[PDB]
C-alpha cells in the first residue's frame, strides 16, 4: 500500500517559512504526480499545487508568489516550501496522490498541523481524574486525564499504551491564556478498575515529552 | 477559478436509508485530455479524506458498492445506499480539470438514532493540580443523542458562568452518539472558598436536569 509520510515543523514564526518533506513509498515519483492541499476550519480544503512526474509544477495563483514544490525521484521525496506565513496560513498541510485516471495509488497522508505563532513551545501538565472519594459506584466507571497548559497542538492521548481504545473520548483542545487544554475520558467496568491498572499516556511531540499518569483511587 | 457548490450543508439520515449529495460547478470541468476529473471524498472524524469516486462515476478500488457517483456538465451527485453508522463524516467534491483545482465546501452526514440520555461524571481537582496552585473541576457528559445539550455549573447553589470551557466530540461512528466536556477553572484559593460544586445537564431525554455534585469538605 501507498504511504505518504510527512516531516516538518508544526510551529512557524510569523513571516518565516514552512518546509515539509513527503516521503513516498508504494509508487514511483518518475511516473505519478503528487499534490499539496491544506485544510482549515475557516477556508476548508484548498489545493495548493502539484508536481507532475516529469517535474513540471503548477500552483494555485493565490499562492504562486510564495510557494515552491520540488522533488528527488531517487530518494522518493517531495519537498514543499511556503514563504512569508501569516496567521491565516494556520492549517493542516497534506501531501496527496489525487486526481486519478487509471492508477491505484490514490492516498492522502496524515498531514502536518502548522501553527503560525510567535508563542513559545510549552509542555503539558497532566492530571489524573479519579472519581471523588465520596463518589458513588456504578457498573461502569468513568476516569479521565486533564492535559493542561501546552503549546502548540497536537498532543496524542492513549490509555494503557493504546490497548484501551474503545469507550474513550478525547475532546478537542481549547485555547485559553495562550495555551491549550484538553481532557480525555475512558469508561471501563467497575469490576476491572482499580484491580486492573488504568493509565493515560500523553505525548507532545513539539516539546519531546511523554508522560504516563496512573489513575489511582482517591 | 471553478467554484464548487455543495448542497446540503448538513444531511441527517436513518440507518439503511439512502443519502443524496449534490455538487455544482460554476463552469464545465472537462480536462483537455477528455476526462472529467470530478472526485468525491469522505473525511471520517479524526482522519484524512479518502477517495470514494473518481472520474465522476467510478468507484475507487475497495470502495463499497453502496457509494455511486453520477452527473455531467455542471451537475454532479453522490448517492450512498443502505447507509451504515461508519459512513458518517464530511463528504467533499473536488474538480481536477481546470487549474486551480478546487473543492466543495463539504456536506456533513449525520446518523439518526434513538434518543439517549447523557452519562454524567464530575471530578474534583486532582491532588497534583492543587499542589501546583490550580483547581479545575471537570464534568463529562457522554454518549447522548440528539446533539443539543446545555450544561450549567453551580457553586454553593449559585450559577457560575465565568471560567467555564466546553468542548464537543464529533458524532461517534460506533453508536452514533455525541459527547461533551465542561471544565470550570478556578484558582486554588477561589476553589477553597466554597464547598458545593454541581454540574447540571439539560437534555430532551429528561424532564429534570441531570445533576452530579460533590462537597469539597466531604473530600
Ligand atoms: N497526446 C499526448 C502526448 O503527446 P506527445 O507524446 O506527442 O507529447 O503526451 C503529451 C505529454 O507529453 C509527455 O509529457 C511528459 C511530461 O509531462 C509533464 C510532466 O510530467 O512534467 C506534465 C504535462 O501535463 C499534462 C499534459 O499536458 O499532458 C497535463 C496535466 O494536467 C496532467 O494530466 C499531466 C499527466 O498526464 C499526469 O500524469 C498522471 C498523473 O500524475 O496523474 C500520471 C500518468 O502516469 C498517467 O496516469 C496520467 C493520466 O493518463 C492522465 O493523463 O496521469 O499531463 C505537462 O505539464 C508537461 C510539460 O508541458 C513539459 O513537457 O510536463 C514527458 O515526460 P518526460 O520524458 O519525463 O519529460 C514526455 O516526454 C512527453 N511525451 C500530452 O500533453 C498529449 O496530450
Ligand atoms: C491572509 O493574511 C495576509 C496578511 O494580512 C496582514 O497580516 C495579517 C496577520 C493581519 O495582521 C492583517 O490585518 C494584515 O493585513 C493578507 O495579506 C494582506 O492583505 C491586505 C489587503 O487585503 C494588504 O494591504 C496587505 O499588504 C497584505 N499583506 C501581505 C503580506 O500580503 C491576505 O490577503 C490574507 N489572505 C486572504 C485570502 O484573506
Automatic annotation (TrEMBL), chain A:
Domain of life: Eukaryota
Residue ranges annotated for the Ig-like domain, each copy included: 124-216
Binding site for Zn(2+): 169
Spans through the membrane: none
Residue pairs linked by disulfide bridges in the UniProt entry: 145-200
Protein name: Igh protein
Biological source species: Mus musculus
Residues represented out of the complete protein: 126 to 239 of 463
TrEMBL record, chain B:
Species of origin: Mus musculus
Disulfide bonds: 139-199
Gene: LC
Name the UniProt record assigns to this protein: MAb 110 light chain
Keyword Signal assigned: yes
GO cellular-component term (any): extracellular region
Domain Ig-like as annotated: residue spans: 118-215
BP terms from Gene Ontology: adaptive immune response
Keywords: Adaptive immunity, Disulfide bond, Immunity, Immunoglobulin, Immunoglobulin domain, Signal
